[PDB]
């Protein structure tokens, strides 16, 4: 396996598996500090899903919330985790998203997701790729089918991996006193692009469902 990413992705997935039990740990009808964030993020899933997917947003609530909150916790492990002293001879210790493979996995997941919706809910024989509006629109089918997953992934992946490198490229020259607005802009936009992959996934499901 590609170890340099997998080793740290294991402990980030451990953070995920613990947040899986955070649900069943504390029941609060009125959630005070911290859990109100959980309810607000559930509301955020409601927002993006009901806004873009359409009707069967709720069985896709899991599939959108997973990538959204996972980009959240991976931004956490990338920047906000104190990792100055730790040293690995296998490679840099930045984030789970350091490898292309995680983002192409999210890509294929979203792709087969809207393909699944468009094959089940619509007909099996033909879906939006079939050339109904104008029968000479096969280049549109080819291009969009070929470009959606990989660049869908690249949109997030580029910024996240770029900052994951830029942080150590900055510390290699100047200590942490200078790179901190860079950390700020990164922690700013890394959750936005999480939202972006989420809403574009949702829009592709809506395309499949229409």
């Amino acid at each position: 396996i590609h170890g340099q990413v997998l080793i740290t992705s294991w402990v980030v997935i451990a953070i995920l598996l613990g947040s899986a039990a955070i649900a069943v740990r504390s029941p609060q009808t009125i959630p005070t500090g911290g859990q109100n964030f959980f309810e607000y993020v559930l509301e955020f899933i409601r927002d993006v899903s009901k806004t873009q997917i359409g009707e069967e947003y709720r069985p896709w609530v899991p599939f959108i919330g997973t990538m959204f909150l996972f980009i959240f916790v991976s931004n956490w492990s990338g920047a906000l985790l104190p990792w100055k002293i730790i040293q690995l001879p296998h490679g840099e210790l930045a984030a789970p998203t350091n490898d292309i493979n995680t983002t192409v996995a999210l890509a294929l997941l979203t792709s087969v997701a809207y393909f699944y919706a468009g094959l089940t809910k619509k007909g099996l024989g033909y879906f939006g790729k079939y050339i109904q509006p104008t029968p000479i629109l096969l280049p549109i089918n080819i291009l969009e089918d070929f470009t959606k997953p990989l660049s869908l992934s690249f949109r997030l992946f580029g910024n996240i991996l770029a900052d994951e490198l830029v942080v150590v490229v900055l510390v290699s020259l100047v200590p942490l006193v200078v790179p901190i607005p860079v950390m700020f802009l990164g922690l700013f936009t890394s959750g936005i692009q999480a939202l972006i992959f989420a809403t574009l996934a949702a829009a592709y499901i809506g395309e499949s469902l229409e």
Binding site: G34, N36, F37, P82, K84, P175, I180
Partner: peptide, 30 residues
Amino acid sequence: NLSVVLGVLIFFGKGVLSDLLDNRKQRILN
């Protein structure tokens, strides 16, 4: 040092997010 300054400011940010959300849950409770 600057790591501590960053952690403190991010603690403040967690606090402002949590208290705005507490205000929302206060609306729901009322």
